[PDB]
Ligand binder design. Structure first.
Ligand SMILES: CCCCCCCCCCCCCCCC(=O)O
Ligand SMILES: CCCCCCCCCCCCCCCC(=O)O
Ligand SMILES: CCCCCCCCCCCCCCCC(=O)O
Lengths: 268, 123, 238, 256, 57, 268, 268, 57, 60, 57, 60
């Protein structure tokens, strides 16, 4: 709940709440009652939609990829990263270090690709999504031996039901996730510079378990992230420029703000 | 705007039926169809709106009432659907009296008003 | 897995149901409520206020303020009739547009007593006397004052008080009556007659007007909800 | 030992004696008071003139003819140029005021008629033309009354206000207006009407110039009548008294 | 924390309810608030008007 | 429960319950026992279906719009308003100020548009509905970047299940919603006049997440409002005329009621 | 539980339990022990499947109607009555006055009507059923404005789920429902004679919310009634004849029973 | 507020029930009301007729 | 999400079942019950009254 | 082991919650942690700066 | 089988919901939290710090 206003009257004293010194790098703690006469107001307004957890706890699409039931592209592969999209990336880079559990949702939708094949009659498509941590045997084909998922976590989803969803723990060797890294991966100060040094979260694969029909179908999988139980430290200024590459913080220089007609113009 | 809305009691006046072009802000006017009296409270006009749709139309005319069927002698009259334009009343006689004439009487439009074309039977 | 079993009526949408649903804006801070005058906790509170009755809805008088005026005058006779209409608070053209009738047209059934208040709007020198009568169904509307005398009447004497209240009571055979036209749920007839005459002095207008106000008593009640037959629409209003 | 027919009301330096009047109507059962410290929003200290602004203001009269449809006044805009009430309203940004309306019309025992005095909150008024809303020069005129009409206003390309008396300019039955605080003047019984109205709004304070809280309408339901030889000029006078008025947001003068 | 309340029964029986969401703007609508007060709109006169007495005296 | 009748007998007194004065603007509180002899009746009738909440708490269709899986019209957009339809609008304009939570339901139905394309074989269609509050980046296309819904609330619905539904809070900067507004938006008394001044509730968008088939399909979405926890103030008379525009209260003048043969006629 | 038998022995007394007088219109309360020697038997038999509620509490089809997604017949309308069918009508007319709550179930089944149209590909059909009490604005068309159901109760059902079902209260202005009425609707003893005087229960409508396919489909809706919490009074004899019209009790005269070869024949 | 009642068992066991709706016209039908009174229809004579006695005396 | 598991017999309509269903008319005020003579609480009460037997059902 | 907590209500009601999984990284996100401390970022000076006093003395 | 009934809103994905879901890595040992300076428990704490205002945003 926000602080209530305190009623004040006139003043002819030596107290100088207005005059301060910004050089000390200290924000003034002045209220409106110091510089004018006010009435008593009881404020019931609450700062409940401003908590960092509530601000970051909303699903956001981080990536989407497509696979087919025929031809060369029979399965899809993505190295997990939250920097592919703009929105959640900018929301997350308000802070230097964060720490959260994750809620993962998938939205898979098939679409009949045009073909000259006749007498088409499809059956229910079933998809498999698999997670391979670093060091796993990556599938080299669709009918590989690694889709047995002895220890790798996997989900089987039949089309026409509520979308699949699982919960992910912190899963970080570091005490907190880093959104920024100032340094290299080798002690000789060369190689990978930046946040790409710490991204080793694994890889994700998706395929059709059956072909379904004698006609080509292209399935698209969309991945939705939701941070839960978030702890944030060291706030940072928001991105003024537009993101270019997920791997690097390289940017094109842009003006500090937008312009107006004159310093005394009340219209943008 | 498209062709004005069709109603079950009113029809477009003579200039409007021929016209095929309706710009924005155009007023068309309706008239009672045969067998329908006009309700004084409602105004039979429709304007063309900016979205190229006409204004809400409500029935501007009500059905006419045929005169009271009267009282037949030595018999009864069912009057099942009421006495409005297009009704049908039936006639009957008591035990021992034979109906001579028509059996029913539709309320139809005879001239400028509505009348019962069939006469009363005697029994 | 706790074994369950879906029952007929699963995965259906009923416009009149009551279940809890997930919020789309969690922990939204709702702006507080200031005290605003005139809170309504029930529709019947509105149906109990007075509303002018358009008794003279005859011809073009509905496109005027004349539909509201009951035209009494001074005549060389005694026992004639002023007005008359049936007790249908939500179907008859006289009652279907007051506040009471407008609330009724949203409900299938009604029950209770009715208040009809008549106010004399003539000169302060004019004097009169009227008979206000209610007659329950079974015989037709009375055609003479003597026939109307036999029902539930009130003799109104136009004095310093300018208003009189005829209370139509509940004399139904059932508990509730249908708002729509129904012979089985008949209501009765309400009429007015000149008890004596409107006697005026010289240099004073002899033609006067009465005004009628309709209200519900504290035992009025309505039942099944329905859609109003008045409002209509052919396309979406943009 | 007295009679409940006479009544006197004192406000500021003004006093109004009715002598022959019906019981006073009090809004929605609420008497106008000040804004509480638990319902306030604006943080600066309000001003309360008290005597200068809360006094009886008497607008210019109108004439009740035999065919008069009726008249209407937007209440905040009627007192906009009157006394210190108008001055404070211009300089300040937010205002909050209750009212007392006292309508007077007298006649002899041989004159007949009936007026309805209704205070209607948020009386939004329709337009003769469906495409555009009515203009301000049409909706509200201060220092004078706005009159209704007996015949529907012609539609076309204009910004007029539909003035049909039966539709009340709001697409509602004029008879059903007895939902708002209302009083009836019967020439054989009454000679005046008195209605006290509190502050009604969805917000604690508001700008009076861009928003009208309530509109006062006087409509002759039963027409005026008399016999030849008696007074033919019968006027109607309206007196308004701002109650518990207060303002927040002192700045430059004008509503520009 | 279950709430047991009375159902709607004819004249001349209890139900159980649990809230599953944390918002209070997501609970079932309240169908049982039978409270009336016509004094605000009807009988709004400043001076009380006893029924049997003459309105104007 | 309605008040029970009290038994009464004959009277020859000076009490005059019938005679009153309507000029005072006071409704008479007379019972039937004042003007006649009555018996004692115990009334068990209840005013439970007359509460404002029960009267307004019923779902009503406020709008419906259509989108396709091919061509120019690939998504649908509606600015939220409860004045597009007649029924709920007239039910809500019995009062000046109202305050309620909302329950929102959607009914989406697809329909195969006629085409010359052959070998048609569709897959399950999935729809996305998104809500953009004022100031959001509105989608300019169907494959836009804003459908990521980082913070904007969104729902994903696969055809063939119970219809989607969520709960909305009061969401008003004002202490109560206004059904009527007598004033302009600019202090100079010009511009937008009326209730359109206060309607800033946002915008709604709907699309197909996939194309589904190689043949055109048109989907129609219907929106159902249900007010819950309603608080109403300042009752107003019901609309005598017929609504014309949602934005303005402009109306065509209409008679006060319907007509009858004579002032002494018991038949409409 | 039925009464247990009481053991009896021989008798030479003046008590005459057998001889009685049927003229008094009194049923004899004689047991088998009065007219013979019996043993003691303990009966555990129960009259639990003979309660009126259990007898009447079983779903029964009262009507079925059909509508299409093309052509003139686009929606279906039925005035509610329990006299259209024979079985539940005869079960209910064992009593004069009854009083029960109702449980309503609908069974809707579509069927592809034969057509020359090619490349047919249907989507999931969705149906709407609406209830209009007496005095409501009846739909004059399928795309009418009244299907908004502002206050009229309505249900939306997608094909391929458990059938829809709702509960109905007594909903009668009379203290009990009447199965028989001896009288007319007008006080002049003419007009509607019989039970049709009291049937004002409203009307039911059904339609397709979408067309689904480019090929005609005919949907059939069946309505099932189930009486719950039943209270019955004044038992009446069962119908000997066969029902002819639902509106009237008109019947064709029939024999009292079937015939046999002779008064001393043990074979029908 | 759960109700525990006895099931239907043979001669010569309990179930639990909760109401979820607030209308009382929506609860399960009562299948256990075994109550009989044939005096109204059988033996309706004003004067009691003892069995062993002569009906007419 | 409380994990459940549907069992055979789900989403079926049995004419002789007993479940609670949502009301279509919430909080409807049911008209009270007057005492009407001749209440029947069981079918067997009817089966115990006398009924004339057509023994001579022979021919016409 | 159910937890009863208070819902989000306006100013000027309880809900029930049970955990079904054994991981604690699978429970609902905590939407009720209203705690503020701006001292770390605002007013970070080593020496306290009273408001009414001159900042430099 | 405990008889249930699905309600409108079943099998839907709302980006702003709050339910429990099954973990994909059961009994994972999460690395502990060291004290890191500058924890933020609310966005408004950031909005209260000073920020230079570009008043002369005129032209280049
Ligand atoms: C079918 C099961 C699949 C399971 C896939 C689990 C994938 C876990 C991904 C963890 C993402 C962590 C993101 C950290 C971002 C950061 O460094 O700030
Ligand atoms: C997929 C999620 C979509 C969520 C959309 C939320 C839309 C909220 C709409 C609020 C409507 C408020 C109507 C107020 C009417 C009035 O002013 O009286
Ligand atoms: C989609 C919702 C539809 C709701 C339809 C409700 C229909 C109610 C029908 C009540 C039937 C009552 C039968 C009474 C029979 C009798 O008179 O004995």
């Amino acid at each position: 709940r926000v602080a209530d206003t305190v009623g004040t009257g006139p003043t002819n004293s030596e107290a100088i709440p207005a005059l301060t010194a910004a050089e000390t790098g200290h924000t003034s703690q002045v209220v409106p009652g110091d510089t004018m006469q006010t009435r008593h107001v009881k404020n019931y307004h609450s700062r409940s939609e401003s908590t960092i957890e509530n601000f970051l706890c909303r699903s956001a699409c981080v990536y989407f990829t497509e696979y087919e039931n025929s031809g060369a592209k029979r399965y899809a592969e993505w190295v997990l990263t939250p920097r592919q999209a703009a929105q959640l990336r900018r929301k997350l880079e308000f802070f230097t270090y964060v720490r959260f559990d994750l809620e993962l949702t998938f939205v898979i939708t098939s679409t009949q690709q045009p073909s000259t094949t006749q007498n088409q009659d499809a059956q229910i498509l079933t998809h498999q999504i698999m997670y391979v941590p670093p060091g796993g045997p990556v599938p080299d084909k669709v009918d590989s031996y690694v889709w047995q998922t002895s220890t790798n976590p996997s989900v089987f989803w039949t089309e026409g039901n509520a979308p699949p969803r699982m919960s992910i723990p912190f899963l970080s060797i570091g005490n907190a996730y880093s959104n920024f890294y100032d340094g290299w991966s080798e002690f000789s100060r060369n190689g990978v510079y930046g946040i790409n040094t710490l991204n080793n979260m694994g890889t994700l694969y998706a395929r059709h378990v059956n072909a379904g029909s004698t006609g080509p179908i292209k399935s698209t999988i969309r991945i939705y992230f939701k941070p839960k139980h978030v702890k944030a430290w060291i706030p940072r200024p928001p991105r003024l420029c537009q993101y270019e590459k997920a791997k690097n913080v390289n940017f094109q220089p842009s003006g500090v703000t937008t312009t107006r007609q004159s310093i005394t113009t009340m219209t943008n | 705007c498209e062709v004005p809305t069709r109603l079950n009691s009113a029809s477009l006046k003579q200039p409007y039926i021929t016209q095929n072009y309706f710009p924005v802000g155009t007023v068309v006017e309706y008239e009672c169809r045969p067998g329908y009296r006009r309700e004084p409270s409602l105004s039979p006009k429709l304007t063309c709106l900016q979205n190229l749709k006409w204004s809400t139309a409500v029935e501007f005319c009500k059905k006419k009432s045929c005169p009271n069927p009267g009282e037949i002698r030595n018999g009864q009259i069912d009057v099942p659907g009421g006495i409005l334009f297009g009704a049908t009343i039936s006639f009957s006689c008591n035990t021992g009296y034979k109906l001579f004439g028509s059996t029913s009487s539709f309320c139809l439009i005879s001239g400028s008003s509505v009348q019962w074309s069939d006469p009363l039977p005697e029994c | 897995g706790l074994p369950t079993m879906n029952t007929p009526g699963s995965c259906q949408f009923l416009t009149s149901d009551d279940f809890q649903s997930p919020s789309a804006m969690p922990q939204y801070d709702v702006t507080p409520e200031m005290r605003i005058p005139g809170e309504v906790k029930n529709l019947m509170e509105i149906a109990e206020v007075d509303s002018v009755v358009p008794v003279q809805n005859v011809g073009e008088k509905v496109n005027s303020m004349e539909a509201y005026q009951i035209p009494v005058r001074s005549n060389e006779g005694s026992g004639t009739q002023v007005f008359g209409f049936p007790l249908q608070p939500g179907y008859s053209s006289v009652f279907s547009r007051t506040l009471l009738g407008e609330i009724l047209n949203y409900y299938t059934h009604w029950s209770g007593s009715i208040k009809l208040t008549f106010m004399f709007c003539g000169s302060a020198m004019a004097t009169g006397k009227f008979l206000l009568a209610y007659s329950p169904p079974g015989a037709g509307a009375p055609t003479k004052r003597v026939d109307a005398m036999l029902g539930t009447h009130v003799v109104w004497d136009v004095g310093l008080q300018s208003s009189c209240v005829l209370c139509i009571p509940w004399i139904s055979q059932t508990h509730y009556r249908y708002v729509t036209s129904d012979e089985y749920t008949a209501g009765g007839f309400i009429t007015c007659w000149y008890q004596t005459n409107i006697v005026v002095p010289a240099d004073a207008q002899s033609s006067c007007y009465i005004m009628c106000f309709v209200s519900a008593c504290n035992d009025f009640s309505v039942r099944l909800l329905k859609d109003t037959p008045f409002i209509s629409q052919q396309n979406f209003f943009q | 030992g007295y009679s409940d027919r006479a009544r006197s009301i004192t406000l500021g330096n003004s006093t109004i004696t009715t002598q022959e009047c019906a019981n006073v109507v009090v809004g929605y059962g609420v008497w106008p008071d000040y804004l509480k410290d638990s319902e306030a929003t604006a943080e600066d200290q309000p001003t309360q003139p008290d005597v200068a602004t809360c006094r009886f203001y008497t607008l210019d009269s109108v004439q009740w003819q035999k065919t008069s449809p009726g008249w209407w006044w937007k209440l905040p805009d009627a007192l906009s140029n009157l006394g210190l009430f108008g001055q404070n309203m211009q300089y300040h940004y937010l205002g909050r005021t209750g009212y007392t309306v006292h309508v007077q019309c007298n006649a002899s025992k041989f004159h007949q008629g009936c007026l309805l005095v209704v205070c209607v909150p948020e009386a939004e008024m329709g337009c003769a033309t469906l495409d555009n809303t009515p203009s301000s020069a049409e909706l509200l005129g201060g220092d004078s009354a706005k009159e209704f009409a007996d015949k529907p206003v012609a539609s076309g390309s204009n910004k007029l206000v539909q003035r049909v008396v039966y539709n009340a300019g709001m697409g509602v039955g004029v008879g059903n207006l007895t939902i708002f605080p209302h009083q009836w003047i019967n020439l054989r019984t009454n000679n005046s009407a008195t209605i006290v109205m509190p502050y009604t709004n969805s917000v604690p304070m508001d700008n009076m110039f861009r928003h009208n809280n309530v509109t006062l309408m006087v409509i002759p339901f039963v027409p005026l009548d008399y016999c030849p030889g008696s007074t033919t000029y019968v006027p109607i006078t309206v007196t308004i008294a701002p109650m518990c008025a207060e303002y927040n947001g002192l700045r430059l003068a004008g509503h520009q | 924390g279950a709430q047991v309340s009375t159902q709607k029964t004819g004249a001349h029986i209890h139900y159980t309810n649990i809230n599953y969401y944390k918002d209070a703007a997501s609970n079932s609508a309240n169908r049982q608030d039978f409270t009336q007060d016509p004094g605000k709109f009807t009988e709004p006169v400043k001076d009380i008007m006893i029924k049997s007495l003459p309105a104007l005296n």
